[PDB]
Nucleic acid binder design. Sequence first.
RNA 1: AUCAACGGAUAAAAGUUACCCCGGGGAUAACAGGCUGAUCUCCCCCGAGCGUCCACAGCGGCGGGGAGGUUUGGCACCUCGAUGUCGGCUCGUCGCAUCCUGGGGCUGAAGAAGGUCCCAAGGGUUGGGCUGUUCGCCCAUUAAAGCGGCACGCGAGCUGG
RNA 2: CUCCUAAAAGGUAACGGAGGCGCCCAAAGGUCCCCUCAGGCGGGACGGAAAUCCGCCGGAGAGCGCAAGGGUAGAAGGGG
RNA 3: AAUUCUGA
RNA 4: GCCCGGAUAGCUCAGUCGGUAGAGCAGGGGAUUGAAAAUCCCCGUGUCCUUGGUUCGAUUCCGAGUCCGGGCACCA
RNA 5: CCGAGGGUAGGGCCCGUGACUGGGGCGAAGUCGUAACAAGGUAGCUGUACCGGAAGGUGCGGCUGGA
RNA 6: UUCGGAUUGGGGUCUGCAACCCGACCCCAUGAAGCCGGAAUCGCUAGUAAUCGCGGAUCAGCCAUGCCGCGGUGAAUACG
RNA 7: UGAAACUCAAAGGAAUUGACGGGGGCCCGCACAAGCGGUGGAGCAUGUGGUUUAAUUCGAAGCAACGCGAAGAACCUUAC
Lengths: 141, 351
Amino acid sequence: MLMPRRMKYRKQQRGRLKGATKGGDYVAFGDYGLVALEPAWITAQQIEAARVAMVRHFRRGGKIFIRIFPDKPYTKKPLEVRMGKGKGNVEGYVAVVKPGRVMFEVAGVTEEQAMEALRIAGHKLPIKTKIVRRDAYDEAQ
Amino acid sequence: LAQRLEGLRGYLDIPQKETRLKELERRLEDPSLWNDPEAARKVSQEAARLRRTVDTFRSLESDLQGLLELMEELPAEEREALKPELEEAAKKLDELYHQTLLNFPHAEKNAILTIQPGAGGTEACDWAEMLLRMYTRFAERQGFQVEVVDLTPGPEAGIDYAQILVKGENAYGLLSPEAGVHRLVRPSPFDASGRRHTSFAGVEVIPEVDEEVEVVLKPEELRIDVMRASGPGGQGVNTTDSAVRVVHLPTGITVTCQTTRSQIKNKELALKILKARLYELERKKREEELKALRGEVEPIEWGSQIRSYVLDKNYVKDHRTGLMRHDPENVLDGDLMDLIWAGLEWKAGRR
RNA sequence: AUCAACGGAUAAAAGUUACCCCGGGGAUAACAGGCUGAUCUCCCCCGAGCGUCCACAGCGGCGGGGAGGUUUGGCACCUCGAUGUCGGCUCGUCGCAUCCUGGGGCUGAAGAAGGUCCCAAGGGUUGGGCUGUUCGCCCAUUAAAGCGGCACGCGAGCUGG
RNA sequence: CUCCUAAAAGGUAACGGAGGCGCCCAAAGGUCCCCUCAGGCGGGACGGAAAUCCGCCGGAGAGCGCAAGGGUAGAAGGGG
RNA sequence: AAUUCUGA
RNA sequence: GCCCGGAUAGCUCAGUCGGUAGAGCAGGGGAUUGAAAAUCCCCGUGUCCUUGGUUCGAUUCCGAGUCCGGGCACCA
RNA sequence: CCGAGGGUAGGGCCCGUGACUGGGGCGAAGUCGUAACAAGGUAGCUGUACCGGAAGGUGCGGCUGGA
RNA sequence: UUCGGAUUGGGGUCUGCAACCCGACCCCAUGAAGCCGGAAUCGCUAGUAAUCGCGGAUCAGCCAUGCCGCGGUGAAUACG
RNA sequence: UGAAACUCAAAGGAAUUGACGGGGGCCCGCACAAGCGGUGGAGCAUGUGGUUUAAUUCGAAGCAACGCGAAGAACCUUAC
Ligand SMILES: [Mg+2]
Ligand SMILES: [Mg+2]
Ligand SMILES: [Mg+2]
Ligand SMILES: [Mg+2]
Ligand SMILES: [Mg+2]
Ligand SMILES: [Mg+2]
Ligand SMILES: [Mg+2]
Ligand SMILES: [Mg+2]
Ligand SMILES: [Mg+2]
Ligand SMILES: [Mg+2]
Ligand SMILES: [Mg+2]
Ligand SMILES: [Mg+2]
Ligand SMILES: [Mg+2]
Ligand SMILES: [Mg+2]
Ligand SMILES: [Mg+2]
Ligand SMILES: [Mg+2]
Ligand SMILES: [Mg+2]
Ligand SMILES: [Mg+2]
Ligand SMILES: [Mg+2]
Ligand SMILES: [Mg+2]
Ligand SMILES: [Mg+2]
Ligand SMILES: [Mg+2]
Ligand SMILES: [Mg+2]
Ligand SMILES: [Mg+2]
Ligand SMILES: [Mg+2]
Ligand SMILES: [Mg+2]
Ligand SMILES: [Mg+2]
Ligand SMILES: [Mg+2]
Ligand SMILES: [Mg+2]
Ligand SMILES: [Mg+2]
Ligand SMILES: [Mg+2]
Ligand SMILES: [Mg+2]
Ligand SMILES: [Mg+2]
Ligand SMILES: [Mg+2]
Ligand SMILES: [Mg+2]
Ligand SMILES: [Mg+2]
Ligand SMILES: [Mg+2]
Ligand SMILES: [Mg+2]
Ligand SMILES: [Mg+2]
Ligand SMILES: [Mg+2]
Ligand SMILES: [Mg+2]
Ligand SMILES: [Mg+2]
Ligand SMILES: [Mg+2]
Ligand SMILES: [Mg+2]
Ligand SMILES: [Mg+2]
Ligand SMILES: [Mg+2]
Ligand SMILES: [Mg+2]
Ligand SMILES: [Mg+2]
Ligand SMILES: [Mg+2]
Ligand SMILES: [Mg+2]
Ligand SMILES: [Mg+2]
Ligand SMILES: [Mg+2]
Ligand SMILES: [Mg+2]
Ligand SMILES: [Mg+2]
Ligand SMILES: [Mg+2]
Ligand SMILES: [Mg+2]
Ligand SMILES: [Mg+2]
Ligand SMILES: [Mg+2]
Ligand SMILES: [Mg+2]
Ligand SMILES: [Mg+2]
Ligand SMILES: [Mg+2]
Ligand SMILES: [Mg+2]
Ligand SMILES: [Mg+2]
Ligand SMILES: [Mg+2]
Ligand SMILES: [Mg+2]
Ligand SMILES: [Mg+2]
Ligand SMILES: [Mg+2]
Ligand SMILES: [Mg+2]
Ligand SMILES: [Mg+2]
Ligand SMILES: [Mg+2]
């Protein structure tokens, strides 16, 4: 679950994934966060299936920040149909994700529960992730 | 009701069984398999609570004129110290007595009465309509949201069918003993010479339960084979596993399909049928359950009544218990809280 | 001029062929192989939660990673101056992802019985009823009545339902 | 015909993504002279949350017969 | 070209 | 799966160039009846399936969606 | 030779039983209409024929237990 | 409408211990629906119908426009 | 030609007395017809069904119950 409620075009091209995030490399919300190491399209089903994995772990606790949003229509041709005859129909939605992107980040919880509620979510993702805590980049002087 | 409640509860019986609990309780006979322990203290509390019952009785019995001094002395405190233990008492007096009755499965649900006119043709169709206004007004003034499901205003007079929702707590537990046959004796307002005939009716009552409809089947719940279809097709039909076969292991019901040449679309049509034929076994058992919730009685003919009503001899004899009031008119308009309790007492007695 | 099949064959025109024919094509489908592995089969990660108690005796929500090349597909690479197509019969042989039998760890293993995973093909893996059937269901057994690959092995070996 | 695909000239395929055209105006055309929007905020009989008024602020987000795009008030827009 | 009226 | 045709009052169904909305039935209030039917006056309620758009305005004209109705799915 | 009896083959009668099906009796209340009894609201009934949800209808001839 | 007097505001008299529910009157101000009534449907044959006013019982008062009486004016039509 | 199981306390003939007939003959009543004035419509009074309520006390139910018990409900009455 988690898809846009609009967009000007129902289907869009596959595009390409050339490394290094366009932004969202620093953690600007919570205490600890989760960052992607390898490029990939994360699915709506995955984002969610990790957001809950997160809460459920530390039930009735902090606040979770999801910083990636599946706004790319993913398509697929029906089964047993042959090539051509127009573009497949929408399957679900994905979010583009390149190396360095801080996807998630938790707030208001112990590092004990952070570096765990994340370790679990990580297993729900199609890629390799790494955990981080606020450091170098901060918005100040 | 108030003065009588005690007796019919095991008033003298329970206070003897009570110590039978603690009886086998003590002496931990190799307390292996856990069994009575659960219903050990809970069944116990029931016991010494017959004292809290005789305390709220005594505090409410020593209360009969527990205001004879308040009829002579209004301002004080030595007379307002047991009272904060007397207001709460007239409360449990009702509690420990109606929380001993409604003490069964699912009663707190919203009920659903149904009225079908028994024998007596048109009379019964009318007497039915009256039995309708009754519970309605009752449940109405009783603080219960009443929703009208059906109302089929029969041929000449009265109705043929009626079904209504009883929105509230313990609504079912209340309007439950009502479930059954209700006879009516009075000269037939319909008959020519206003002669005296008897009328019969049926009043079923059930708890509101099912609201949704889910019938999803896990993969392991079934089995899917695939073989070469039988029929026309030359090389095709001969070298392809177009023919599918879904089998639902639990029910044993199986479905096969070689409709189209696609193993795939055939699985589809297959399950499509399988489901359909699974809900049918789902609704066949979905009603052999809820229908056994109507009772095992009520032929709705003569001699089946469980409480008659007369008007040319003003009274209402409840055959079930034996009770007989002399105000049919009052009963048929609300007055029920009397025979409802008793109705239960009679019933809950055997459980 | 809906010559709109829009650079517009005649002013003027639809079907059928299993009764068919010739010229061509592996430039192009149906079989088999090939490449791919969505589908399929098997395996694994995470650990919500079930299991009276206890995440892992037996289970595994949401999600995630693979393997194999049995199935349904995608593609259209050899073959259209021909690679005979289902099932049965006969003859087998190889795999292991083991149905028996031999070993072994767990168990929610008292014992006898089981369950689950590990090791291990040496050898075994029945007779019938129905259907062309493969597949299935059933009868009667058994230690067990395994699942596959061999052009879904085998028609210059047979059958031809 | 309009955009994208199309890799910053032009061009560029696919039974790729998404829409329009087979008309229309005697003024919706020439020219000369004037005029300037949509909105938002307050004020106002009937008055919606836009009818017509008044006042500030509004550089173009309005308008341009119909699709899209480019263009455009220093007019292609509005009026005579 | 105009029905029906149960059952003490 | 493809291609047609649908959805409008409680049921069965009309309707328009884009502003409107209906019939028969059921149903409510009256009338004859001893009391029902029949019959006789009086009645009304609808996003015109959903969700987009065009328009100044959409039941209506286009995109899409859901449910139902038809017709095809052939050579191997 | 005959022979109780046993076996073999085909018949006849009766009893029991059978998915389903035919119509019947009964059943203090259903649904449909109202055929017959009063010119029963087309007088009725009758043998037969055809027809129809159902009583019933209609045709031909017969009777009056009707006018 | 100088028709019709509902409803309502305001001011008062009286009975009763007491009139908010719930009294009858009085006066100022309001002045509504109603332009002769669908399907239907009632009474009366002569001092009757129609029409006008008075009395009594009840009873403190009074929700009487009711009921029971009294007289004043005084019709139409009846084939069958 | 021609049974049975089962089931009912009757089935049935004639003739009485009535009631009834969309049978007949004869005959009455404001029954129709002839005619006049109303009701159903409107506002108000009152009775009742109904609903409501703590209670809205009870009875009357076609004609022959509904301005009927009530020829007088503020508390009395008055039964709720
Ligand atoms: Mg949101
Ligand atoms: Mg690079
Ligand atoms: Mg019924
Ligand atoms: Mg029904
Ligand atoms: Mg064929
Ligand atoms: Mg094939
Ligand atoms: Mg030409
Ligand atoms: Mg042409
Ligand atoms: Mg061309
Ligand atoms: Mg041509
Ligand atoms: Mg042939
Ligand atoms: Mg030939
Ligand atoms: Mg031939
Ligand atoms: Mg030839
Ligand atoms: Mg040839
Ligand atoms: Mg080729
Ligand atoms: Mg080639
Ligand atoms: Mg192939
Ligand atoms: Mg080959
Ligand atoms: Mg999973
Ligand atoms: Mg292969
Ligand atoms: Mg293949
Ligand atoms: Mg190629
Ligand atoms: Mg070939
Ligand atoms: Mg050759
Ligand atoms: Mg050859
Ligand atoms: Mg192994
Ligand atoms: Mg053992
Ligand atoms: Mg065999
Ligand atoms: Mg055979
Ligand atoms: Mg083999
Ligand atoms: Mg083969
Ligand atoms: Mg053959
Ligand atoms: Mg042959
Ligand atoms: Mg370019
Ligand atoms: Mg370029
Ligand atoms: Mg403005
Ligand atoms: Mg306005
Ligand atoms: Mg110009
Ligand atoms: Mg000009
Ligand atoms: Mg008729
Ligand atoms: Mg009937
Ligand atoms: Mg009768
Ligand atoms: Mg409809
Ligand atoms: Mg209109
Ligand atoms: Mg109509
Ligand atoms: Mg009506
Ligand atoms: Mg009526
Ligand atoms: Mg209407
Ligand atoms: Mg012999
Ligand atoms: Mg027999
Ligand atoms: Mg007959
Ligand atoms: Mg008849
Ligand atoms: Mg007749
Ligand atoms: Mg008739
Ligand atoms: Mg005949
Ligand atoms: Mg006929
Ligand atoms: Mg005749
Ligand atoms: Mg007053
Ligand atoms: Mg008049
Ligand atoms: Mg008048
Ligand atoms: Mg004889
Ligand atoms: Mg006789
Ligand atoms: Mg006569
Ligand atoms: Mg007279
Ligand atoms: Mg009136
Ligand atoms: Mg009495
Ligand atoms: Mg009353
Ligand atoms: Mg009075
Ligand atoms: Mg009193």
